[model samples]
Structures are given as structure tokens and as C-alpha cells.
Target chain A: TIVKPIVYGNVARYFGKKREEDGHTHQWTVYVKPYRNEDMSAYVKKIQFKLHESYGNPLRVVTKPPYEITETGWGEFEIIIKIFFIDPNERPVTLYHLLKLFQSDTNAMLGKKTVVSEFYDEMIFQ
Target chain B: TIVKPIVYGNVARYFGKKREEDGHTHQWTVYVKPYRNEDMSAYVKKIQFKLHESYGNPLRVVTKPPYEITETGWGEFEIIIKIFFIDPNERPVTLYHLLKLFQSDTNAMLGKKTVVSEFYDEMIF
Candidate 1:
């Protein structure tokens, strides 16, 4: 059995000015990374991300390190993250993360602010 | 369902020199905290940590913020961390974190270096 530690979340930066028509006001990136940035090639094969339905193609897959997605949007939604293992016997692990573009601390949200929200978890493979 | 984000891990710092008897060369701190150090008082009531049996009173419970345990030792082992929520209906979540003291990059291990090993996870209630 293998136990892997992972961190997943989003980093969002407020746009200097609001968009005209689309009204998109922030750009953000969501990612699933190994703890301490360890190499996961031995265990992880790929990662899949399902974003908001408004996007053209909400589904995305990355086969290499830096498993992440970048997008610009005005609203927040829940994102589904799935990790595929090299060993086919292991089932893909799925996690749901909320896209947070605003900070609970309003003072910290002012100006061209950057908000980071990440969670820590361990994946146990039996 | 409420999704709470958390980070649990250990920070180990090399003690300049190893001891002669026990050979314990590192001091480490293991903790369980909310992401971005947010206040977890609203939902979390306490946290319990179980350490290696070699230590006295290996089981510890913290009722306040900065739920952590600090100790000095040489070898590495696995740690068990449990989070208890305020709502009695919700069951406690248990997590296993391996205390990492050595760095894969041996070159970076020289001198009085500090190694941090933390993982990200979401607790759904």
C-alpha cells in the first residue's frame, strides 16, 4: 500500500478593471500538487479537472507535472478534480473544491489582490 | 455538505550535531491547521494527535488553535491526526501523516537545515 500526500486549491488575482461585456473580473488557477513538490511519476499517471459549465470545454486533462488549469471568470463554482494512478488496479480519486475568488477578509480583498486557498490531504492506496 | 480545507504536516530542523547516546539529531513540530490559517473555532472543537509509542503520553488532545505537537528525535515514523467537529452529528475524521525528517535531495540536507513536509486535503461534512 502507498500513501501519498497532496495539496489542491486555487490562486486568484483580481483584475485591475472589470471587463466590458463579459464582466469577468478575475483570473485564477486551480492545481493539484504533491506535498513539497515531490515527483509523482511513479504513482500518478494523469489528472483531470472539470470546471464550470460556462467554459467552452470544462473538462481538461494533464499528463505531466504542474497539474493545473487557468481561466478568467466573474463567478465562482465547484470544481471536480480527479487523479489517475499508474496502476490500473487503483481507482481514480475524485475531490471537489470550491473556486474562491474573494477573501473572507474584505480588507485583504481590496486593490489588485491575490487570494490563495489550498487544502492538504493524504491518499491511501490499499 | 460543508467542505473544510486543512493542512497537516511536520517541520524538522537539524540540530547542528548528533547526540552521542540516543543519536537524536532533529527537532520537529507536527500540526493540523486550517488553510491560510483561518479560524476553525466555528466548526472544529478539538484535535487529537497520536505519536510514536517511545514518547511519554503519546496521545495528545488540543482544544484551541495551532493544534500541534513538538518533540525531538532521530528516526522517522507515522503520525495519526484526528479532527473533532462541534456538531455531535458529524463523526471525527482521521488522517495518517508520515513524519518526514530526511530530504530526498541529500545535497540540501547539509548544515542546520529545516525541512517542511505538509499535505493539502478537504474534509467534507
Candidate 2:
């Protein structure tokens, strides 16, 4: 049998945190968290968010973390996320997040200029 | 000057992984990590391990990616390790651990009895 748990993630871009350098005006964020609020997060040790190779320091790690990162960019790219478990019994997980900017519909929060995309999935640790 | 990292822990007792009609064999383990190997333990999101409340569940919780439990009648009883962080945050850390049973001058290897114990530090995040 495998240990099944809920894992959630978010990728967002905020328009208002604009930069003087217009090219990098959008604030982009990508993160992962436990779906249940009861504190099962201990199963995780850390998460590394790997940005596109074109960016500097493509690998960004968060240990003292809520397991997420934020940056400013004008373009959307694919991000690689690595999840590490605290127990040796579980293997690490790697997934990708396609940072999306313009949506087919007006899906925005805290205002239309902002866009946030996310996903919910299950983690099966055997 | 917060983010004072270097969290490490280990509690162990292993007579055997065998269980039968005899008295319960010795097999207990308590653990934490990140004593400087560095990866930051992803800043930890859970760490709930409490024992010895007249031998039952006690009120305890830990968040940040490390939880432990035990079931063996060795000696020693202590609790409480609280930490709060999400990378550059802090509310962590207490100090306690005394499950020593496999560390002396003669904790050897090779003896067909199913022995398994290893130590590893963290890596920079």
C-alpha cells in the first residue's frame, strides 16, 4: 500500500507590483502546500523551484519555507519543482508548472489585472 | 540574527524488528534533521512527536516536514520542540533527545540480525 496525501500548488502573477523597468513589472509566484490544514506538512523536507534555463540561478531552493518563491519577470516560462521528503521511506517528486499570463477568460483575483493559476493533486508515497 | 539553523535529532532503540508471543522487542525511533548539511529541510512544516503522558497521546503538534512516533519500553521521557518558519522565518526549536542505544565503542556491523542505522547531514539550499 502507498501513503496517499493531498498536495496543492499555486502560480500567480500580480500586475500592481510594477517595476520602474517595465520589462519586469509582473510579480510571479509559484508555491506548494498541503491541502489539508492539519499540519501533515512534516512529511516534506523542502521544495526546489527550478526556473527556465535562460534565467539566472535557475535553481531556487526553499528550506526555511512555506515552500515557494516569488520573482519579477515579463514573460511566462516552465518551472521545475522538486519535492523532498523528510523520511527516507519516501522518494522525492519532480513536477512542472507552466507559468501562464493571459487567460482565455477574465479570471482574476484582487483585481482583473492579476492572474493566479493552481492545481490540486494527490501524493502517493509507498 | 535569527534563522539560527542547524537542527539535528535522533532517538533509537533496536533489539530487533521481530514481534511474537514473547515480551515486546525493543524498537523505538525518534528523529529530526538538518544539522547543517544545509538543504534547509524546506524550512519544515510539521514536527509532531510527543510521548509519555501516562503512556498515551498528549497534545502536541509540529509543522515543517518532520514527524516522529515511538513504541518501545526503554527509559527516558521528555517532550517539546517548537519551530515556526517558512524560509527566513522563525519560531522554532527547543532542545531534547536521549534515545541512545546504538552508540558506544562497540556498535558494530555484520551479524545476521537485521541491523540498519545510518547518519547523514544536510546540503545547502
Candidate 3:
């Protein structure tokens, strides 16, 4: 039920060029993870790797998206993931698995990332 | 610069019910297609069935969404598609193909939907 406004930084402008050259537009997928209380350092470390593996490197991690965050209590410690491409023709199965793995692992610790959401063409909260 | 505000209408209310019951929010996917001048009636006819196949049925089609269309001259003749679900775990490949098929068909006629957009949790475009 948490609605987060995941925004694109310069990454969008980068894709805008490709969109201009190509007749089609560029698309993106974003992933978010909330920190776990248990083994904080370990979980944070895994998150760093999982994020890089899922999205590209953390080009930038803003406290909030360019827009406002309407959902409360979700906290300001939220992390956003963004991946750019030309089409949804290819599914990021690897990223999907990474999310599942994180959820499964953290669930064992009693403290989990809880919410994993994706935003594409538009945003969707899961 | 055509920005169409595709509204949820009753669908949002339905999801709201689910949200209250399940404690988890629901998400949706919308598809849109403009008419092709070549096929004309064929395209419109196909659109009717395609829309049915993609979305459940035209629960209703207001002249416009609850919001205003910021994109210009994309024309008032635009079409919107909406799909509701719990997660993106399941990709609607069939719906995707339907759109691709329509695009390819109209493309052959030198007239196409031109824009095939998907709107989810938040409006990204």
C-alpha cells in the first residue's frame, strides 16, 4: 500500500538520446528495498550487490524521488532501482530472482525488505 | 507531446476493496491504440475485439480520463486499455502479442496506433 515516487535522474536524459535516434522510446524498471533490522551490515552488503546485479551501479541514490513520497511511515531510508531499455521484450529474470532471494533470506531473519516494487512505463506497487 | 491521463474509474474502487481485505495494494496495466486510417473499419472492428480480449470488457469509456490530456494533437480518438492484478509476477504475454499484432497489421497499412503505452503504479511518461 506504500506508494513511492521513483524518479529518473540523468539516466533518463541518456535514454532520451537513444529514444531520439531510434523510432521507439526507452523504458525503465525500478526496484526498491527497505533495510532489515537484523544483521544490518550483512543485509546492507547483500543489498548493495543485489542492487548492482539487478539494476546498474548506483548512479545516484537520492533521499527521495524527484517527486514527493505520498506514502507515510515507509521512512526516508528507502532505496530505488532503475534499469533502462528499449522494450519489455526481455524480462529481467535475474533481477526477479535476486528480489525473491532477498525476501526469502530476510524472512528467515524475522526482519525482511518486506516490499519489493517495480515501476515501468509507469509505476506499479506490489 | 501527447500526454493522455488514463483513469481507473470503478476499477480503482474494486482494487480498493481488495486493498482493504488483503492489506496489499493492487496494480494495473493500461493499453491504448489509435485507429488506423487504412483499414478504417477493419481496424476499428479489430480494435473492438482486441480491446475485449485485452481488457475484460468496456466497463465504460468516458470521453476522457478523470484528468486532462496534456499531449497535443495525439487526437481525441485515442484508446485506453487497463489490466488489474496483484503483482508483475505474471507478464501478460498474450496481451503484449495482441498489441504487437495490431501494430504490425496497421503498420502494413501505413497507418498505425503509433503509440502503445503502459501505465502502472505511477504515471511515468
Candidate 4:
């Protein structure tokens, strides 16, 4: 007798691996850019995060992206943020928060036409 | 004295979390579908594997997708493959291999015009 396996939903695009080692896990590297021909420094933001479902806790990083101002444009120059996670389940939740913060920061920098104020805020905050 | 940090590359789009919990990891979920309005059953083959970089051993899964053929078309019906990884360092290499296999499988299935022989080979093999 032949048995049929049950399939669900429509698979759209398959990339990357499904399994992982015992000690280590996978990390997400996100790349963001402008929609069209818009200024990249004004629109793009890159973020990285690890999946910590096994521990069931959220992690937190209270560091800022490094920034630089050149003749071509101005944006994050260098970034070295420290991450902290006390609870395993909080990992997903903290990731969501960081994502929102990055989006908001990018928007604030670009939405404002004045580059001077943006730099000013950065200098003051740093 | 102010020190400047060197920035490289262009940030395209940012999504997901920037941090993770200790002793934990992330998993990638892939979705593949047929291009255009072509029949899905004729187009897709699903596969899964793991990443093991630290242990430095390649993990392999010699399993098949659960398949079903309906009047609508023919394709993988379901998939549940077991992954084996003996080393941690092999995680990255294993991931690359699994990716290649999944791509090749899908192309082989959809690239063929006739479904009869494809199904025959699957059964025999």
C-alpha cells in the first residue's frame, strides 16, 4: 500500500538551509535600499539578527549605527552594537522592536530635508 | 580626539531583529512556486537541510518529497526530510549543498515537458 504525505499552502521561493548544528544556529542579514532612484544614504538601512527560538527569549541591543558625511552623501558610517538577551522567548519580541527602531530612524533622517539638523542630532546623541 | 568609524557597502532594506538570545539560532523558511500561470504540481520539488559550521561536517538528507498526482497536475504532494549534522563547522557547507540540491530538483522536475517518465523514474529510483 502506498501512503500519501500531506502538503499544505503554496511554496513561493525556496532559499537557504532547513537544518542546523547542535550548538550554533542561523542569523538573518537584511539589506535595505531606496525604492527607486532616490538617495541611498537617505533610504537604506542594514540589520542583522539571530533566531533564538530554542532559548525562548528576546535580545536587546542599545547601540547606534556609525555615521559618516561625505561630498556624495551622509549616512551610517560604522556600527558595532552589543546585544543582550535574558529570556529566550523575548528574542522574537526584541527583534521586532529593533526593526521598528531602524525603520523609524531611517525615515526621520530622510524625511527631514535639512541635513544640518540630522547631523546635529547625531552629534548630540553620540 | 574623535575617532571615526569606517563604513562599507550600501544598506538596501532592513527587516527582522538585530539581536538574538544565547545558545539559540535562526532557521530559514523557503517557499517555491511555479512561475507564470503554469500548473504548480508540474513545477515544484521541496527539500530541507541544516547548517553546521563549527563542527565542520557536511550533513546529508537522502529523502524524497511526498508526492501526489491529481487531474489538476503532478508534483510533490508533501515533504518531511530528516537532517543529520555531525559537525558544527560543516553547517555553512551543508547549507550550500542543500540549496544546490533543492534548485536542481525543482529544475529537473519542471524542465521536463512530460510528467509520465518523471514519475516513473521517481518510483523506480
Considering every candidate listed, which one attains the maximal lDDT? 1
Q: Where does candidate 3 stray beyond 4 Å?
A: A1-126, B1-15, B18-32, B35-43, B48-125
Which interface RMSD does candidate 2 score?
A: 20.3
Judge candidate 2 at residue B2 and give its lDDT.
Answer: 36
Q: Please give the distance, in angstroms, between residue B53's alpha carbon in candidate 1 and its true position after superposition.
A: 28
Estimate TM-scores for all models: 0.53, 0.45, 0.19, 0.18
lDDT tens digits, residues B20-105, model 3? 44343323233333222221121121211123323344343323322112211111123343332223452221222111112221
In the predicted model 3, the residue pairs found to clash are A123-B121, A123-B122, A124-B121, B2-B71, B3-B71, B31-B81
Q: How accurate locally is residue B67 in candidate 2, as Cα lDDT from 0 to 100? A: 54
What is the lDDT for A99 in model 1?
94
Q: iRMS for all predictions?
A: 14.9, 20.3, 17.5, 19.8
Error of 2 at B9 (Å): 26
Candidate 2, residues B13-101, lDDT tens digits: the string is 55655456545456665665665555444666566666557665664564534455556654545655454456554455554544434
Model 4 chain A, poorest ten-residue lDDT window? Answer: A117-126
Q: Positional deviation of B95 in candidate 3, in angstroms?
A: 6.1
- Alpha carbon lDDT at B100, candidate 4: 11
Between the candidate structures 1 and 2, which one is better when assessed by DockQ?
A: 1
Q: Write candidate 4's Cα lDDT for B39-114 as tens digits.
A: 3232223223322433233232323322221111112122222222233332211112121111122222224222
The DockQ score of candidate 1 comes to 0.04
